[PDB]
Structure 1
Amino acid sequence: ELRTISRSIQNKKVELQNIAKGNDTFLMNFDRNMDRLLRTIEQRKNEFETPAIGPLGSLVTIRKGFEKWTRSIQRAISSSLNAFVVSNPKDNRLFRDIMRSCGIRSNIPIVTYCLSQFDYSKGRAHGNYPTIVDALEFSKPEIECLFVDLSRIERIVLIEDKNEARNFLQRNPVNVNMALSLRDRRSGFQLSGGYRLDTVTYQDKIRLKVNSSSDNGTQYLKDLIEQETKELQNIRDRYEEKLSEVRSRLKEIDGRLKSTKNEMRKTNFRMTELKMNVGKVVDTGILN
């Protein structure tokens, strides 16, 4: 398990290097063959009435100031980030054949949707808290409208404190379906209706662009691989301290086993003495 952890950390580090280009490919967060799939779509674009657009997470960037919310937002819209958009059922069939030829193994959602810009101002959450829409930057306005339809991002508010988020939702705020709250770096809270509180583990792989330089995260995670070697050592030796306690129990019972072996060898010596005594010369003939 810990080998997998440090290794995934390092591959993520070299993937942010590939944000521009490189060896370990950055798009690997969606699928290992994602670079091949996108090149094949571009090569066959003339066969599509409208070329397939995706993966959607590559067209979405976290706005500056919302970096702390990246994993919580990604968990909320995780179904949409891996998706590809096709305008019609014919392009959907052509795209599925290209996915099969490219050897994609990841489950990729295909959304058949005609990209359109529409006014969603009436649907925005009313409150002093920023929404997922305010936290994100979209490559095109039609992609922003698509996330509003698929994930209702305009109705998801970001509230740091769990109790404040619960109290806000209990007041039935206009146009709010869910509140995201922070717990730790590996997990967060998703609150719906003010009564439902779900503790959600964050996915290890990031599928949203972050406006922070790759070195920020990778090298802050270089000191964080220093901290992850800390993680490996800690877990391994706490289990090994557990192992040490149980093997000291083993050595205690072995000394008890050694003490029993010494008792048994002494009994064997005593029975050997008994049989030695049985077979001894008898000097009772003169006595008789």
Structure 2
Amino acid sequence: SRSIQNKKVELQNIAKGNDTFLMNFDRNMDRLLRTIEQRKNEFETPAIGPLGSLVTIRKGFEKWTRSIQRAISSSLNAFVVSNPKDNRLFRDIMRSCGIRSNIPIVTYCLSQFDYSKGRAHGNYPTIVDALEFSKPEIECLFVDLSRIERIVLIEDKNEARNFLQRNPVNVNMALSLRDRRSGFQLSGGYRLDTVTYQDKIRLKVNSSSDNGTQYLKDLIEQETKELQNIRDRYEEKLSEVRSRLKEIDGRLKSTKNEMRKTNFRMTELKMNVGKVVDTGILNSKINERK
């Protein structure tokens, strides 16, 4: 139940109003970002946005996308700084109405390189194309440190795998998740590494409709089926142990009947203890005969 109750109607309960990622990160910037964006852009060079809106889900295709979404959310906030005194003043300004959040600060400049030559081109779409971005260089300045387009993204057991077992030559990595709920990153010769995503409605992903858990139908129905079979086998085992209990209760009844019959028989015993005996004539007659 807890596997799904966190999003049972909350995704439906948006009050028919746009739920901006500004407060989806946590409750308290939405009242202060409108007034603090100018302050961020004032000192030093103008501050780049937290990249929450710059990178967003496109066409609602997040099954393959979440693996790279987690990697880019590992370092998503990018604010530009050049003066440590200005950095401390920026920290003080950020602590205006309370943040209660961890905001990475990134002043890495734009990078200029081509990123299509490295990949292999195939029918299955590239994972990055699933995401939506404004400027390629914004993501590329993080791609250089850890290339994300090169890796081969597949399911747990399919083709075009074990490249790391095959070792990379003129390529770098072929890691990928194994499961949609929690996919261990593919590693041939290395231990797989899990990745955990976050689910939120920051865009109008309900533009077509706002019905209750259309995407969650399969998960909840499979969970109900699992509960059904688990409770059925549990009912079978409790039924058989209860039948055994009924049998032992029946033989308890048999033992109680036996002991009560023994009680009747001892009542008979002292009935026949208290009876007259007529052997006096027999003994006297035997003496007379002798």
Q: Establish whether TM, by shorter chain, passes 0.5.
A: yes
Establish whether residue 56 from structure 1 lines up as the match of residue 39 from structure 2.
no
1:189-216: CA deviations, max 9, x gaps? 2024553322334345578997986848
Distance 1:251 1:50, change over 3 A: farther
Task: Give the whole-Å Cα distance in 2 for the aligned partners of 1:64 and 1:83.
Answer: 25
> Which protein has the larger Cα radius of gyration, Structure 1 or Structure 2?
2
* Larger fraction in strand: 1
Instruction: Note the residue ranges of structure 2 that are not aligned, 5 or more in a row.
Output: 283-289
Distance 1:285 1:145, change over 3 A: farther
- Relative contact order, CA 8 A, sep 6+: which one is greater? 1
1:75-108: CA deviations, max 9, x gaps? 2333123454546656544432222113111222
Distance 1:65 1:105, change over 3 A: closer
SS at the partner of 1:216? coil
Distance 1:286 1:14, change over 3 A: same
Cα contact 2:178–2:186 (8 A) shared by 1: no
What is the TM-score with the length of structure 1 in the denominator?
Answer: 0.59
1:146-200: CA deviations, max 9, x gaps? 2313542223331224454642332234565444545444211202455332233
What is the TM-score with the length of structure 2 in the denominator?
Answer: 0.58
Percent of paired sites with the same residue:
100
SS at the partner of 1:183? coil
Task: Give the whole-Å Cα distance in 1 for the aligned partners of 2:242 and 2:77.
Answer: 48
Which of the residues 216, 220, 225 maps onto 2:220?
A: 225
Which of the residues 132, 141, 147 maps onto 1:152?
A: 147
SS at the partner of 2:198? coil
Cα contact 1:84–1:110 (8 A) shared by 2: yes
* Larger fraction in helix: 1
1:242-266: CA deviations, max 9, x gaps? 9999999999999999999999999
Distance 1:111 1:192, change over 3 A: farther
Cα contact 1:77–1:151 (8 A) shared by 2: no
Give the superposition deviation at 1:145: 1.6
> Aligned residue pairs: how many?
283
Distance 1:59 1:25, change over 3 A: closer
1:4-55: CA deviations, max 9, x gaps? xx89978878887899994865433322223245323323256223222232
Task: Give the whole-Å Cα distance in 1 for the aligned partners of 2:100 and 2:221.
Answer: 32
Identify the residue that residue 245 of structure 1 maps to in structure 2: 240
Q: Which region of structure 1 is more displaced relative to structure 2, 253-262 or 32-41?
A: 253-262
